[model samples]
Target: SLADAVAHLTPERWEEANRLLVRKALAEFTHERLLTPEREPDDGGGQTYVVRSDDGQTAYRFTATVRALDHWQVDAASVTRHRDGAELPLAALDFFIELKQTLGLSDEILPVYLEEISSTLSGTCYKLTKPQLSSAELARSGDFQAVETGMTEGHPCFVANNGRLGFGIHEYLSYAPETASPVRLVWLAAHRSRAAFTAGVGIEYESFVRDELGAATVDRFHGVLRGRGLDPADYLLIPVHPWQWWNKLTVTFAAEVARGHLVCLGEGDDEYLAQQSIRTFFNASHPGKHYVKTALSVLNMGFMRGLSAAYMEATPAINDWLARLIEGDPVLKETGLSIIRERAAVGYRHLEYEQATDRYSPYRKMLAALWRESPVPSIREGETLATMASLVHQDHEGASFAGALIERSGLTPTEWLRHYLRAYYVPLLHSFYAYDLVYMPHGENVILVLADGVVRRAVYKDIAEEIAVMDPDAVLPPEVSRIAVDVPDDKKLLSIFTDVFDCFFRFLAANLAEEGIVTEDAFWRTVAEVTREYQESVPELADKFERYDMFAPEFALSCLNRLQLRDNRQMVDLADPSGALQLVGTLKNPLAGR
Candidate 1:
């Protein structure tokens, strides 16, 4: 029947008819067509039909079914009457049918269509049932459509717990039928200690789950989970937060007696339980020396058939820390020592260490190379240190491990560590540096007593939250510190700071030029223009900008204020009385003497 229906039309008509059919098939059976426009009511003239093949690559055929004077019938007459229509063979009408049935197309297209359908369904379900939806269900299905739509539209998938759908843009609609029921069940089995829930939840939720899903998603999901419980505090998720789902889990885990009762068990009970147990164990005991043993045991268990980088990256950091204990510590010396020794040997051989004496040792050479490559003031000075330290000290509890390390180091640690890290880390983290530089306030310029002892004025930078790096043991004073200075109130310190930033910019431009790293002239021109505009518009800040140019204008403007100079300032001043014009003249006429 399909072939017969397709066999009656011209090629163009056949193609058009099949396209309509494919659209309808996608709309009715799947969530929605991502690329095609929505179907509208027919005006009783032209007909549209779509035809699909199992393989996405197969050519699509479209047929238009039109009702004529004789009632509903194939509209091949239109094709026959068209200008140059005689050239088109009627056999083309069967093209789509042949592609679908005779071609025996691959089944690969099913998965793609199913994926789109699933996403649309999930999103639609989220919108329709989100208010009544359980926290867990909401997390798994809520705004799923939006997220998928965002992906389809080439945007970030923004999922939030605030009950807002598609916060930025509306890309697609979604719906899910199974989201209303409790599809997954979580049972907190018996634990060994009072801190059992905290430990278990922390390990399972924070360490394991967060590692798997990422910190942002974990935070949101945990909140959803906690909302279901009565006493949320008792339940603990691995990464403890104020969210209700996390709290519920903590309480459930903490219960002195195992609460064997079934909580909402989603579609896959066995899979969920197995996953939950693994996550729980990793969260709890992975931070100690036992982690490596456990990892080996897991490999042997066959429950985990194999491990991958994905698995490894998702494993809690505590697990890695614990594994390192067996791998590195003196107590578990025998367990992994041979492997370590073997690895060390392999590493040594790769470096050709035997050929190099102490003077040419790769480590020493590396350090020397870094020192040579370092910027002037190869050492970070007092003001920088103070600024970094102050940032570290603020809300010390939430400070990153690196910040903590810095804070714990005594004020004199800089002398021991040589203050070069400001230069080292700042440049290394240039991308994130913009954010850190602008967000943190300047540190005190004067000295004050730190917890360890008296720190000299302007010796450190204000400490703030920062990303932790490898080598946690390496330390110096807090990377940032604060300073107190006495300056005239009428001086407009803010304007001065701006000028100083400009000067810093000029210095950067000069430095980059010297290093042969100058970007396009247009780029530099844009910078000069912006700087000139800011200077002219905010005259009060002009002197500060000039001062910044004289000092470290690049650092001052780019890092400190997150501002770029405009291009207009790069224009040569032709009318200056002080022979400023002569300066330009000399540059323009380099061969004047010759």
Candidate 2:
């Protein structure tokens, strides 16, 4: 039955999902200064706040504590909805519509924004159906893929984080990362003239393809080309998302297929599991094989999740350049920081679309993918891997995963924080101070290598698109120059302040404190101490360090949701100075004068 696809979307589940979502909406919106909740008359004296609807007919009352970085820690169980003195059911869509004016959601974006909210709420209900495990048991098992798929939350900042609008119920079950459904990628033989294949310094096209698709599968593919009276040598194989093939290529790219410029070669044999980022796939069939990232035109979060064909030409080169820089730098090597390089890429250019649209158009990004090395082969026997995101994950019982890890490690909370920060944060500082380089560095972008529930090192992924060098005068190879960005001098440090502290650490510290594992003060002090240690270790970069000022008293608060609310389709123009950044005010730097 088609209805079976949404079996998890029961009334109980929907109600719970609404409760959870409204809690997040209130918390994050207030933190972003989009909503201002007034303090209600003393209700048991725990500081209850009530927010009224636009027409003043409804109100939401909740008990919350304002944490560091002005994070509103709303208690999910304490949320209540009221209308003229009568209690009402918690409705997330209604909550958004009520505050639409306050949140500055334009009329054009409101309904689409509500669609994303519905999708996110549905995804949460599906997650609730999974077997709930204690964080201790999950950490004790040391299962990498389990931890990866088990992550319940996506991005910490964006409330509409899982708005996979293109997916119907069936596709959501098949492709969503949380489902952990195994997928077989469809293969296409693209004509070499319109399609280009590029690889890192040591990789070649034929062997890499054969290795990924087994020799027998490669033979079968070649036979398909021969069956069409097409020379196998005249075409290069590209792996594509099955959804893209059925939905986009079959229709939008019909001209290319009809003219024999593109040939369908059927599905590859290896089974892959979708990762947290949605478009990227992890090789479950062969643990050591490369992770393939595809161009998915589905709208999610802030933009159309597409990989630009033009950007693909220089991806591997940019990855190679960054890898070499990391290897050559002593400070980076000492922190045990390694990047899972994007090894090879292939892109197809539809000349008509290329001519019709601007360079930034998603049409030019329809058919492209790059292969990134898997981190499996590098792990030691005792060391296990988990996404850095798992640190901030809270299980069904409201238990923090970081708290579980600290308990399992048999180490002091302070000691555990020190190890984790050294493995993860030190390298970020070095990259910024030493090379003027910064990465997206969100939880999903990093993988943590751990032994005995203690973090040992980090492996960075999603390289070419996210890494940027802010120094305009920095030397760069022509092919690698696309990674350079000209951010303003004063705003450059926001990379660390906003991304690391406000987005990541704000949540981490709050969760740790709520769980009684560590205090907020201890967390920030340790962060300051880590910064000082890294600075001492690299005295040669003292001039650069002072100029950047890691301990500055304040930094701009970059609003992520503001961009999404303004334009969900294309949130930021990446080529434009940090892409229409919404800097509302300054957050007091927690590391200042520690």
Candidate 3:
């Protein structure tokens, strides 16, 4: 309907209609003159004149207004006209001509009676000519004669070369009003496209004529393009935000039919339509529920994995099972429920260790190295001498010769075999053999002495094994001393070393079990003392033994001792499962105690 109405009117006629509508709507003002008139011979009897106003005068004038209306008003002045009975003044006739000209109306059909009266009232005789037309040719003509007529001598109209339609007030308003009147002219001039009226000019003119106007012109072009579809590149309209655009698109897609669009393309094609119909049918029928039911039907079979393997080979069957699980089984939907509930019931809690150094061995080694290199060394020469003496006594010839007999009897495999045996088995044997030695006043001294001697034999055997395995050419026989004058063969020396070292490990483990800390000072002191004694007794093998520093022996002893101590403490204070659970549960529930 709107498109039909718009198409019916020519562009100029449409503009005239808009102008008339604007004028009629804005003709409510009461405080000022809505329209300004030009001076001319009165068609009735008296002379017509124009009224001009000073700044201080309170005459109404045309102004801009909203609602696509041309605004005008009458001001509170000396002269006034009756609303119903008063005849239209001669000056009002000039105003009407100006209004029509502005609207592109150019017909020269005046009433004969008005023309006769105008001729009789004027002093100068003049010949009437046709009014200028609003055609493109006349609009383009540069000659003023084309537009001039009998009353065009001092006509208010000015046709610009650029096709602008302008008007003058001086020629039209040659006489002044009888009363002290004020008037103002307001006209519309479009900045672009001279043919287009700047709507605001007309609106303002109307407002000036009607002094009763109120409120501002918030907008003008409201319904101008109501029926026309907007182009994507139109800049006159406000832009939509990116998020809003996407949201609109999504809504349109979701409710396709409601928005007058199709959800998918080529719906009319037979194959495509069939496929879509099938999909919609299955979705509406809830195929997933049936599929899940079919899968759960096989739950009686052994484990889930076994069931999976049996069904996985069948694609259609698997799809059916997955569908049923998704749509039918409420239980399957809450798969992670147990973990969630457990965590909810027993808030998470974990042990936070304070001293991290106790967990590692590097810090211990650093501390030991610091102590060894300290300016004020605590180890005395007497202690070293006593350790050496004890080493010799413990490993004297009688001890080695007895060890040799034990070795020849084939009590163990190779010397390396003794290393594993001593580490694993000898600790228990020594715990029984030296039970009282640990508590005795001379117990530490005796144990240290024996440990030193045992370490020397172990070191010798270890070096021999390393040489034999890593570099066979470097192997050598064990050294002999006065105490070991009748010492047994190399195998015998190895067996004795194994037995003694095993017993030393057991002693160390026992002490750790009773006391949390490992007492390493006595052991290391004894090792140094014994090593010195061995070197002196057998200078030939000193280089080989010294080359392999006592790092491994010290490490093995420290680890074994620490493990024993930790194990014992753990056994003594076993954590109660129920108590731990309760503690965790309490944290989860704020009102747990209540």
Instruction: Please provide TM-scores, in order, for all candidate models, with all chains considered together.
Output: 0.19, 0.98, 0.12
* lDDT comparison, 1 vs 2, better candidate: 2
* Model 3 lDDT at residue 106: 28
lDDT of each: 0.23, 0.91, 0.20
Worst window of 10 by summed lDDT in candidate 1? 339-348
Ranking by lDDT: 2, 1, 3
Cα error, candidate 2, residue 399 (Å): 0.6
Candidate 1 on 1-594: residue-level lDDT in tens? 444322323444344433333333332121111113222335645354333333433333233322111111122333221112233332322332333333222354323323332333233333333333222221223232211111110000111101112111121210111222111223221112212221111234335434433576544544544564423334332211111123233443222223422122112121111111111111121211111101101111111211111112212332223234334533223211111000000000112223354422222111000000001122222211122212212121122212232334443323312222222222222211111122122211111122222222222111111112222233322321211122223222223232222212222223233323333232244343433433454464455444334123122111110000011111122222112111100011111111
**Which segments of candidate 2 are over 4 A away from where they belong?**
41-46, 577-579
- For residues 1-594, what per-residue lDDT tens digits would candidate 2 score against the true structure? 777888899999999999998999889888888888998668666679998888899999999988889899999999999998899999999998898888888999999999999999999999999988888888988888899989988998999999998998899999999999999999999999899999999999989998898799899999998888999999988899999999999899999999989899998888999999899999999989999999898999988887888888999999999899889988888889999999999999999998899888899989999999999999999999999999999999889999999998899898999999999999999989888899999999999999988999999998998999998887899998877778889988888998899899999999999988899999989999999999998899899888999988888878888888888988887569466789888888888885
lDDT of 3: 0.20
- Per TM-score, the best of the predicted structures is 2
Evaluated with lDDT, which candidate comes out highest?
2
